[PDB]
Amino acid sequence: MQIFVKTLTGKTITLEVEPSDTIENVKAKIQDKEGIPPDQQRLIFAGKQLEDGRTLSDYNIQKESTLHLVLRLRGG
Amino acid sequence: MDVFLMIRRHKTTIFTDAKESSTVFELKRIVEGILKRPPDEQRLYKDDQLLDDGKTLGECGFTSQTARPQAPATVGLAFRADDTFEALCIEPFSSPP
Amino acid sequence: MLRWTVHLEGGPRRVNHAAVAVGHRVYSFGGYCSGEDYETLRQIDVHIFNAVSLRWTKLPPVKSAIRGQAPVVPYMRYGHSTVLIDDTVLLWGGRNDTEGACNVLYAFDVNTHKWFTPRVSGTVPGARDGHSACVLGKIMYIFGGYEQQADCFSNDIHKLDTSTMTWTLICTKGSPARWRDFHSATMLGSHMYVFGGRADRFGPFHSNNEIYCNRIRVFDTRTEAWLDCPPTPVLPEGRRSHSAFGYNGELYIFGGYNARLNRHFHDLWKFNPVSFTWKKIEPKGKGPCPRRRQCCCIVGDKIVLFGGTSPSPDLIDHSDLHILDFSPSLKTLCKLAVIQYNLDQSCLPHDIRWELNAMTTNSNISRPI
Amino acid sequence: MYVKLISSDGHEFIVKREHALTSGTIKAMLSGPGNEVNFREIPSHVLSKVCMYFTYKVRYTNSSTEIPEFPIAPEIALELLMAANFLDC
């Protein structure tokens, strides 16, 4: 599965994942691609916050979906 | 609405303000309070144009947009000498090097 | 009329710091900076800008008072607040990347530069960052921010009565300002004016419905009520991480960031609480570039504005400082002209030459990256 | 109501006392022990500009409407700076 992760500003990151992969795995892959530590990442789909324990298939996230990424505002 | 002025005679310069709607005569009464000569002994000028007592400053051409506090408009002043009036004479300011 | 009269470099390179003016000296605490360490054990920082000599200095590290006992000093953090009451700075909230947010109250004596943690009672507000803080007499008012433990935006007001060091969660009347962070709150008389900030359009949780507030909200500290206020036909664009300050009875807001527009600001807006109206103001001179989460502090008729972050010509952190002078003297205007026209200064008297030097010499806290 | 400020070259500038109090130095002189002030080191082309600054400062204090700046030409900037420092305005 190919999924997309977009911050509110507009940067888009394409990730290669399986529906079995957990949200912790997705944040880890985002850290590999963008260098953002997982504890500074908040992932949202369909207006709900995605918990690290569950996987992508648990949240009905299929191929070509976009997740919304919220980041810690260290610079306000 | 307000005009900012320099009233100038010889080596005298009065800084004052007045309304566009105020009269030349009212301006002469300000001069009288400061320089102790009555309005009938004064002539006021916009450049070489002698101004009439009953005209407003606006009617004389003074406008708020061209008589700003940081760039006031000049009104020339001449006093009656004995039976006639002195020539309008304004001494220039000094010069930078 | 109002003018940007000083632009200096070489200061602390910080965004999301907090600062207060103590007389003619601005005290700046902590803040974030890219590439620098916010994980390991580090003391918070204090830099002092002297608004007369126009010089930055930095205080040395806090030492242990007694053997074994750790130095008493907040850990390095960003997103905290600082307010001044008499000789005491009260520092509260904020976070780093490791220990998260903290809710221990810290007090810093502006004359001895000693830190302490006064014993507090009452309902201590949850740890958070991006809250606002302001004071009326001996009372500090905390509003909003993002709570770390509850993991949500706040719209509570907690007051700290410093006479007894007692926290109280205020049971307010009226409709509270929407849960938000990185807003401002400013006291004009007895009323607290809350402007801007990031929020969610439906409630207190992130839900991918992020909005930027621009409807000013007013809290009366006397009745402890949120007021219903008249419409403002003109108003600034919504934004977070602007600076707000109260000057001569009116509220001013500078700069900030709107993520819906992806826009940084360097505008200046004035709110007159009596007519309850907004007006955009254009200072003379070249301002700071559009930026967010700078700090602004009032010194007399001047605003000291410094730090912040902005997009790089991908963000840069600012080490510069700007002075906005609400009432420039002729001496200030002439100094600017002498500088602008590159005139020979060597025949000026030494007192004026010292002033010209002060406004044209960078400090050495930082160097270009 | 009005005071007289005399330049080094003998020009007499008559300005409102309240406007002249923009200068700390003139304010102190008008309340000296035991009117008019004579400035032996400020020439008329400089002192006239100073008086314009007085008018401007008083008119536009606590003003938020867009207004022109106070213009300072290069040829006068050093002298005007020296006068402003001496006059504390």
Numbering used by the authors:
A (entry chain D): 1 to 76
B (entry chain B): 1 to 97
C (entry chain A): 1 to 313, 322 to 377
D (entry chain C): 17 to 50, 58 to 112
What do the authors report?
The largest cohort of CRL SRs recognizing terminal degrons are the four BC-box proteins in the KLHDC-family (hereafter collectively referred to as KLHDCX), KLHDC1, KLHDC2, KLHDC3, and KLHDC1031,32. These SRs all feature Kelch-type 6-bladed β-propellers that recognize C-degrons bearing terminal Gly residues. Members of the KLHDCX family employ Kelch-type 6-bladed β-propellers to bind substrates, and a BC-box binding EloB/C that serve as bridges to a cullin (CUL2 or CUL5). Importantly, we discovered that these E3s share a defining C-terminal carboxylate-anchoring element (R/F-S-R) establishing them as C-degron E3s.
To understand the basis for C-degron recognition by KLHDC3, we crystallized and solved the structure of a monomeric version of KLHDC3-EloB/C bound to ubiquitin at 2.0 Å resolution. Blades 1–5 contain β-strands that are contiguous in sequence, whereas blade 6 contains three strands that progress into the BC-box, and an outer so-called “Velcro” strand from the N-terminus of the domain that fastens the β-propeller. Together, the blades adopt a funnel-like propeller shape that engages three major surfaces of ubiquitin: the C-terminal di-Gly motif occupies the bottom of the funnel; ubiquitin’s preceding C-terminal tail residues bind in the funnel stem; and ubiquitin’s globular domain engages the top. The KLHDC3 C-degron-binding site is formed by two distinct chambers, which are separated by a ridge-like feature and analogous to those in KLHDC2 termed the N- and C-chamber. Residues that precede the substrate’s di-Gly bind in KLHDC3’s N-chamber, while the degron’s C-terminal di-Gly motif is buried deep within the C-chamber. At the bottom of the C-chamber, a basic patch engages the substrate’s extreme C-terminal carboxyl group. Key contacts are made by a KLHDC3 RSR motif (Arg240, Ser241, and Arg292), all located within blade 5. The structure explains KLHDC3’s strict requirement for its substrates to terminate with a C-terminal Gly: its Cα is tightly wedged in the stem of the KLHDC3 funnel-like structure, which would exclude any side-chain larger than a hydrogen. The penultimate Gly is stabilized by a hydrogen bond between its backbone carbonyl and Arg292 from KLHDC3’s RSR motif. Asn16 at the bottom of KLHDC3’s N-chamber pocket forms a hydrogen bond with the carbonyl of ubiquitin’s Arg74, and also interacts with the carbonyl of ubiquitin’s Leu73 through a water-mediated hydrogen bond. Finally, loops connecting KLHDC3 form the top of the funnel-shaped substrate-binding site, and approach several residues from the globular domain of ubiquitin.
